[PDB]
Every structure is written in structure tokens, then in C-alpha cells.
């Protein structure tokens with residue numbers, strides 16, 4: 001079992017030749033590659049290189065594959081050494097992964113001279129000046145669609161209709177109040193105009209992206225595309241629903257569904273996430289914190305039921321009890337544990353107040369336990385980008 | 387900036403939901419979505435004055451979520467700032 | 473245990489001061505020191521329902537201090553607990 005001496009800038013290392021022959025494609029494992037570094041006067045291979053790194057390089061052979069970077073050695077210096085000793089692409093990949101680096105993909109255009117041209121200014125805002133323009137306009141349209149959706153609820157506008165003084169219930173007024181705007185081919189309502197324009201553009205982007213994208217299979221997998229769709233679904237579904245129930249009795253029978261889709265319109269806010277690095281980071285953060293986010297909700301649930309129950313019974317024998325039932329106390333318990341404390345429900349008895357005191361303290365600890373982990377994940381994804 | 391931005395997103399999201407959830411109530415404390423912005427900020431920062439509160443079951447579910455969302459929203463960017471200060 | 477203990481100390485200390493500070497007011501919301509315990513806990517944990525509030529200048533100075541003291545009181549032992557959990 002012939003021994004080999006490797007001198008790293010004066011620091012002496014020794015191993016068995018069979019330990020190095022284990023990996024024939026590396027510098028040290030290949031006689032022809034290491035020949036260049038042999039000093040026949042001293043019977044050693046000499047490398048005028050970084051010292052703190054070699055330990056791990058040699059341990060990789062002794063361990064049979066373990067490549068751990070020493071805590072005291074910078075990742076950029078170590079990786080250069082892994083490359084120098086020619087440990088190979090597999091070890092390198094295993095290293096980066098374990099080091100917290102895994103990326104890989106990129107679907108370019110089909111090389112259509114057309115598709116690749118359209119796709120570049122509809123997803124890569126830096127591809128060109130026009131690309132930016134499209135992105136800027138997209139943000140403006142999103143912001144406008146939000147402001148408009150909100151103004152639809154202002155009394156100055158909605159409180160001005162055919163039955164604003166409790167007179168009747170006009171079918172056109174009843175659906176205009178439910179939907180938020182007047183749907184008519186005449187386009188009299190400025191709100192319907194703004195909403196239609198905005199949805200024309202959202203519809204445009206979604207279409208242009210669906211036909212200029214390299215793959216149509218990994219499309220409805222991208223959360224961004226899902227968002228793009230959700231942003232237009234309400235509009236078209238409302239049209240369909242109103243035209244399929246064009247009578248007072250019918251509409252009244254589908255109003256709940258119509259209302260649900262009106263609320264869904266606010267999800268268009270998330271369209272900004274395509275232009276917000278932070279919103280993307282937040283997204284990555286939440287995806288990685290599902291477990292802790294679940295514990296948060298779970299512990300809060302336990303505390304809510306526990307405290308709601310106790311305060312309910314503690315106030316039960318009082319004529320002025322502010323707790324009609326345990327389920328109703330859930331509200332008070334959440335408002336107390338999160339320390340919001342509106343004051344619309346409060347215990348009035350000594351036992352209720354002892355329960356409330358505990359409820360508050362329990363809330364602070366309950367929330368405090370899982371949050372830090374989430375904050376940590378965010379801090380990680382946040383700097384990894386910064 | 388992220389703090390203000392995330393809070394803005396949450397404010398609009400929660401103001402919208404609570405508004406519609408209380409809309410069909412004669413005693414609704416939310417005249418419009420923009421007016422609910424106040425309640426949403428007061429809840430997310432956990433101030434909770436109590437001058438505007440939901441009264442329906444759907445409004446209270448929205449409010450509960452709004453409070454929890456506020457704690458996490460603020461909690462995410464602050465630590466970095468605290469670090470810079472330190 | 474330290475959490476509960478420090479809170480207890482602060483509760484009694486602040487309940488006492490606010491009680492005496494509001495004592496000479498016909499509309500005092502603090503019937504006795506033990507009754508003020510409630511207000512002091514609700515303030516130190518920053519819940520702030522608003523069902524009991526000081527109305528005098530001295531009561532409000534006491535209340536201001538009570539709130540700040542609460543934040544530091546809770547903040548001291550919690551981190552350790554959060555650490556054990558982590």
C-alpha cells in the first residue's frame with residue numbers, strides 16, 4: 001500500500017495511493033495529470049495553493065465521496081479548489097445543493113423569429129426599451145383597475161340611482177348594485193368602461209403569453225399565469241351569469257354567485273407580483289413556511305376554543321353578558337390573543353377578567369412561537385436575492 | 387418600502403372583503419371600501435380602536451384573518467431594519 | 473414564571489398609581505386598586521379594550537408608562553421560550 005505525500009504550500013499531507021486511485025478522473029487520481037506536480041528530490045507532489053481547503057479535498061477521497069466545505073473557508077475559494085482538483089461535475093452539483101443552491105431551467109422561444117420576439121417583451125422587461133414600456137403600462141393598468149374597483153363602492157357614486165330613496169327595486173338598478181357597474185352595449189357607465197378597458201388589456205396579456213410561450217404544458221403550473229387568469233375570470237363569468245338570468249326572479253336566484261365573483265375581482269391586486277421582487281420573495285417565503293403557518297393557525301384555534309369556552313361560562317349567569325354562546329366568544333378570543341382589543345365584547349365579571357388576562361398573555365406566546373421561523377425563511381429568501 | 391407595500395396590499399385586500407361581508411346590513415360600519423382602509427390598518431397594526439368593527443359572521447372571519455395577517459406582515463421586514471439600527 | 477411574576481409586579485404598581493391619580497374625580501373609572509388590575513393587564517399586554525381608561529393628566533402619564541413597561545416586561549422572558557420551542 002504505497003504512500004503518497006502531497007505538500008500544500010508547506011502543509012504536509014499523506015495518504016495511500018489506493019485512496020486516490022478510487023477516483024481516477026480527478027487530478028490526484030490520474031498519474032498523468034499529477035505527474036506535473038511531482039518533486040523527485042523530496043518524493044512529494046507540491047501545490048502552491050490554498051491551505052485550509054485541502055483537508056476537505058483529501059477527506060473526500062478518504063470518506064469515499066463526502067465533500068464538505070470547511071467552516072472557515074469562503075465558498076468562492078473552495079469552489080475554485082474543487083474545480084482545480086477536478087473533482088467533477090457530480091461532486092460539484094452535490095456540493096452546491098448541500099450548500100443551498102439549486103437552479104437550472106430556462107425555456108427559450110421555439111426560435112420562431114416571431115414567438116421569441118414577442119415573448120421577450122412580455123416577460124423580460126429588460127430585453128429592450130419597448131419591453132419596459134409594456135411592463136410600465138401593465139402596472140398602470142393594474143393600479144387603475146384597483147382604484148376603479150374601489151371607487152365603485154363610494155356612496156357619492158352608488159348612492160345615486162333610480163331607487164336611492166327606498167322607492168322601488170328596478171331590475172337594472174338591482175344588478176348594477178350587485179355587480180358594481182352597468183353592463184350595457186351602450187357603454188354609458190364610466191365604471192363599465194374602465195373595467196372593460198382594463199380587462200381587455202388583462203385578456204390581451206394572458207393571450208399573448210399563452211401563444212408566445214415556449215411550453216404550453218408548464219403554463220397552468222406557473223402561479224403567475226394562474227393569477228393572470230383569475231384576474232379576468234370574474235368579468236366573463238358575470239356576463240355569462242347575467243345574460244343567462246335576464247329576469248328579476250332569475251338574477252335574484254344567482255345573486256350570491258355574482259357577489260362571490262365581485263369579491264374575487266380584488267385578486268387582480270396579485271397581478272403586481274409579476275413586477276414585484278418583494279412580492280415574489282413573500283410568495284417563496286409562504287410556500288416554504290406552510291408547516292409553521294399551519295401550526296400558527298392550529299395553536300390559535302386551540303386557544304380560541306379554550307378561552308371562548310371559559311369566558312362564556314364565567315359570564316353566563318349575568319344579565320348583561322356580552323357572550324351569547326361559545327361560538328360568539330370566538331371573536332373576542334381572537335381579538336384578544338392577537339392583542340387587537342376592539343372592545344366591542346368584554347367580560348364584566350371577576351372570573352371573566354381572569355380568563356381574559358390569561359387569554360391575552362397566551363396570545364402573545366402563541367403567536368410568538370411560530371412566527372420567528374417564518375421571519376427567518378423570509379430573511380433567507382430576501383438576502384439570497386439581494 | 388416593502389413594509390409599506392405589503393401593508394397596502396393587505397389593507398386593500400381586507401378592506402374589500404370586510405366591506406362586501408357587511409354590505410347587506412343596515413348597521414354596516416363600512417360605508418365603502420376606501421373607508422374600510424382605516425379599519426384594516428388599525429387592525430393589522432393591532433391598534434384596534436373599536437370605532438369601526440364588523441358585526442356579521444363573515445366580517446369577523448375576515449377581521450380575524452386581517453389581524454393575523456397584520457402581525458406577519460409587519461414582522462417580516464422589521465427585523466432587517468432593527469438589525470441595521472443595531 | 474418570571475413572565476407572570478414581572479407582570480404581577482407591574483400590574484400592582486400601575487393599578488395603584490392610576491387608582492390614586494383618578495381617585496378625586498367623580499367620573500373615575502377605577503373603583504379600587506384591585507379593580508384597576510384589569511386595566512393594567514389590558515394595557516401592559518397592549519390589548520386596550522377601552523372599557524376602563526384614565527381621564528386625568530396624572531392618570532394618563534401613569535397609563536403611558538404602563539404601556540411602555542408592558543412591552544418591555546413581556547419582551548424580556550419570551551425570547552427564551554421562543555428559543556426552546558425553536
Ligand SMILES: [K+]
Pocket residue numbers: 338339340431432433517518519
Ligand atoms: K397591540
Ligand SMILES: [K+]
Pocket residue numbers: 339340341432433434518519520
Ligand atoms: K391593541
Ligand SMILES: [K+]
Pocket residue numbers: 339340341342343432433434435436518519520521522
Ligand atoms: K385596542
Ligand SMILES: [K+]
Pocket residue numbers: 341342343434435436520521522
Ligand atoms: K378599543
